Structure 1
């Protein structure tokens, strides 16, 4: 009923390893330089071709981000585990669990934000001063939606793409009937 699909800006999933790792040994084994040891207790790496980000804690409890695809994140975690075993430490692939998916899209028409905020005043929340976008948190399912004037709808909260599109057609009629002009 939307007539358009939203696009995803990031996929953030949690892939553990279940294996203790040593970040400074990784640093000495590394091929890299942008890090402050006195800045974070988990190492960050973005590999080249998928541009995906890993946050590796000392026990291999890691949350993937920077990914646009679930299988891309899975092969990224596989590449990371391959890197760790090439270093010489165990890293077995473990559960690929998504905790958040980031998406953004446009609908390209003027909108009645005051009407939206006043009428939808259960979850809608808008101020024009500090931000040009509304804050909306529908609870079934618990998905947070943000509403630009220009139709930039940045989407987050869903743990799966089908639910984030389910949010998109959940919000499409109430967006469409609250247009300006």
Structure 2
């Protein structure tokens, strides 16, 4: 294909192994918002790497927004370090990436309804609901959002390799339905 999808977002979970007083975290950490009435967790953001963590009373958290596996682990470590610095027996445990999202640009337009009619068992296209075509790939198990513009969204991957393999697999069919 000659193109390599760009990783745009990585979601990871981390068990800090120790109960937390969310009310206290929200009070001593900067850039933290806590509104239990709507979500039972403290939302905290940091600038390097630019990410957002969801911290729970159970001591477990979700780190989002990271653009690489390293930034994800690194950011996760900083959040844990803050929880500690606040006064908890937090530890960096069970780090695990749960989802990777990537995007592409094949540069050419795509006749989506032709692609949907051709691959009916994998794609759901109804512009009324959503402008992009939803392609549910089997191997690897990656969901793609194909747009008329040639823009491609790939998600559902746990290894960055799946995004790459998903894109290579779809390129031929994308090319086949190129508007030209």
TM-score, normalised with respect to structure 1: 0.93
How far is the alpha carbon of 1:32 from its aligned partner? 3.8
Change (3 A) 1:164 1:10: same
How far is the alpha carbon of 1:126 from its aligned partner? 0.8
Distance in 2, Cα, partners of 1:172 & 1:31: 45
Matched with 1:25 is: 24
Which structure shows the bigger proportion of residues in strand conformation?
A: 2
Cα RMSD (Å): 1.4
Distance in 2, Cα, partners of 1:31 & 1:149: 42
How far is the alpha carbon of 1:14 from its aligned partner? 1.3
Change (3 A) 1:33 1:12: closer
Distance in 1, Cα, partners of 2:32 & 2:93: 28
How far is the alpha carbon of 1:53 from its aligned partner? 1.1
Change (3 A) 1:31 1:94: same
How far is the alpha carbon of 1:60 from its aligned partner? 1.6
Distance in 2, Cα, partners of 1:135 & 1:178: 15
Describe the superposition over 1:140-174 as per-residue Cα deviations: whole angstroms up to 9, x where unpaired: 22110110000111111111111111101011111
1:55 maps onto 2:44 in alignment: no
Distance in 2, Cα, partners of 1:56 & 1:30: 12
Change (3 A) 1:33 1:94: closer
TM-score, normalised with respect to structure 2: 0.94
How far is the alpha carbon of 1:81 from its aligned partner? 1.5
Distance in 1, Cα, partners of 2:2 & 2:170: 13
How far is the alpha carbon of 1:34 from its aligned partner? 4.1
Distance in 1, Cα, partners of 2:84 & 2:90: 6
Describe the superposition over 1:122-145 as per-residue Cα deviations: whole angstroms up to 9, x where unpaired: 111111223221011012221101
How far is the alpha carbon of 1:69 from its aligned partner? 1.4
Distance in 2, Cα, partners of 1:33 & 1:109: 43
Distance in 1, Cα, partners of 2:136 & 2:163: 13
1:38 maps onto 2:37 in alignment: yes
Distance in 2, Cα, partners of 1:11 & 1:32: 21
Report the number of matched residues: 180
Distance in 2, Cα, partners of 1:27 & 1:84: 10
Structure 2 residue ranges without an equivalent (≥5): none
How far is the alpha carbon of 1:54 from its aligned partner? 0.9
Give the 3-state SS of the residue equivalent to 1:53 in structure 2.
strand
Change (3 A) 1:6 1:32: closer
| CA contact 2:12–2:62 (8 Å) conserved in 1 | yes
